[PDB]
Amino acid sequence: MSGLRVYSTSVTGSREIKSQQSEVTRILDGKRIQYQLVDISQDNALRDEMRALAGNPKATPPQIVNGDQYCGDYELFVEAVEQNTLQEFLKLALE
Q1: Residues 8, 78: Cα–Cα separation, whole Å
Q2: Which cysteine residues pair off into disulfide bonds?
Q3: CB count, 10 Å around CB of 7?
Q4: Separation of alpha carbons 9 and 47, rounded Å
Q5: Rounded to the nearest 5°, which phi and psi values hold at 46?
Q6: Cβ–Cβ contacts within 10 Å for residue 59, how many?
Q7: Where are the alpha helices (DSSP H) in 1-95?
Q8: d(CA 91, CA 95)
Q9: Coil vs helix vs strand at 70
Q10: Which domains occur in the chain, in start order?
Q11: Euclidean distance between the first and the last CA atom of the chain, given in angstroms as a whole number
């Protein structure tokens, strides 16, 4: 059983972060995906829970997670669809 929980910021804090979260959900939304959104903006616990499990207190709201592990981030995911690599990060070639 493999799930997908993308992190984001509902309340939003910065003015640029909104541009990132939008681009992320934009692609997924257009793809008509049924993934959840683990927004840390809800509870502060998610903030100190994501940075910990992520092993990096420099990350950002946009973070792709597969269940309970660090799947990727904004740069990665976005850096994939660009060259059509998104699969290598999503399906990882499960043909």
Answers
A1: 15
A2: none
A3: 24
A4: 10
A5: -65, -30
A6: 15
A7: 17-30, 44-53, 74-81, 86-90
A8: 9
A9: strand
A10: 1-95 (3.40.30.10)
A11: 17
User: Torsion over CA of 43, 4, 89 and 44, rounded to 10 degrees?
Assistant: 10
Query: CA torsion angle for 32, 38, 81, 12 (degrees, to 10)?
Result: 100
Experimental method, per PDB record = NMR
Q: How many helices (H) and strands (E) does the chain have?
A: 4, 4
CB-count burial class (<10 Å; 0-12, 13-18, 19+) for 13: exposed
E strand or H helix that includes residue 6: strand 5-8
- Residue 22, both tokens: 């939008």
Token representation of residue 42: 């809800």
> Are 87 and 72 in contact, with CB atoms under 8 Å apart?
no
Q: Which residues pair with 66 in a beta bridge?
A: none
